[PDB]
Swiss-Prot record:
SUPFAM superfamilies: Flavoproteins. PANTHER family: FLAVODOXIN 1, FLAVODOXIN 2. Residues 3-163 form the Flavodoxin-like domain. This is Flavodoxin. Its cofactor is FMN. Pfam families: Flavodoxin_1. PROSITE patterns: FLAVODOXIN (PS00201), FLAVODOXIN_LIKE (PS50902). InterPro entries: Flavodoxin (IPR050619), Flavodoxin/NO_synth (IPR008254), Flavodoxin_CS (IPR001226), Flavodoxin_lc (IPR010086), Flavoprotein-like_sf (IPR029039). It comes from Nostoc sp. (strain ATCC 29151 / PCC 7119) (Anabaena sp.). The keyword Cell wall biogenesis/degradation does not apply. Keywords: Electron transport, Flavoprotein, FMN, Transport. One of its GO terms (molecular function) is electron transfer activity. Low-potential electron donor to a number of redox enzymes.
């Protein structure tokens, strides 16, 4: 339909978060694509995109998003609105917190994607992040390992913001 959510997952947390994002948006709005089963051309099917990706192995892309990283050069994101979220561990990995979505966004916005859905760094404890854009996160940062009780409200709040930014 209108929003395509393309998520990568290893232990399933970003997946869970994606399911709640669909629930929050109201039913048919967001479709949930596991990028492990995706082709890079699937991104052509939407004008509004949500990109979901955890950071693994000290500052790296989740390996299914890594599998599509190079091929992002084969897609034109011009004219699309794009939002980002990920799961992360701010305590264990304070120098590389939410690096992944920062890596995806830098590439996608270079190919024409307009970023929406910036998120406040308030209430997170970390040192450095590739997701940082003029004092904000490039997208929604969830931490299921340390802040699981904050997740549901952070998504509900983020979804209401995206409706406004997507012009739904
Ligand atoms: C070996 C390992 C490395 C990790 N590296 C990072 C990291 O670099 N940055 C970060 O924010 N989180 C890191 N984490 C935390 C994961 O991103 C976190 O557990 C996330 O919720 C997993 O998402 P997923 O289940 O969708 O794969 C790491 C976790 C493991 C165990």
């Amino acid at each position: 339909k209108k929003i395509g959510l393309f998520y990568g997952t290893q232990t399933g947390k970003t997946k869970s978060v994606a399911e709640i994002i669909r629930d929050e948006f109201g039913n048919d709005v967001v479709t949930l694509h596991d990028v492990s089963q995706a082709e890079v051309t699937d991104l052509n099917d939407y004008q509004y995109l949500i990109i979901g990706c955890p950071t693994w192995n000290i500052g790296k892309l989740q390996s299914d998003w890594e599998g599509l990283y190079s091929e992002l050069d084969d897609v034109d994101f011009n004219g699309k609105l794009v939002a980002y979220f990920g799961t992360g561990d701010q305590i264990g990995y304070a120098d590389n917190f939410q690096d992944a979505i920062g890596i995806l966004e830098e590439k996608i916005s270079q190919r024409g994607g307009k970023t929406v859905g910036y998120w406040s760094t308030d209430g997170y404890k970390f040192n450095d992040s590739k997701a940082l854009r003029n004092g904000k996160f490039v997208g929604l940062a969830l931490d299921e390992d340390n802040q699981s009780k904050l997740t549901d409200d952070r998504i509900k709040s983020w979804v209401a913001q995206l409706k406004s930014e997507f012009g739904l």
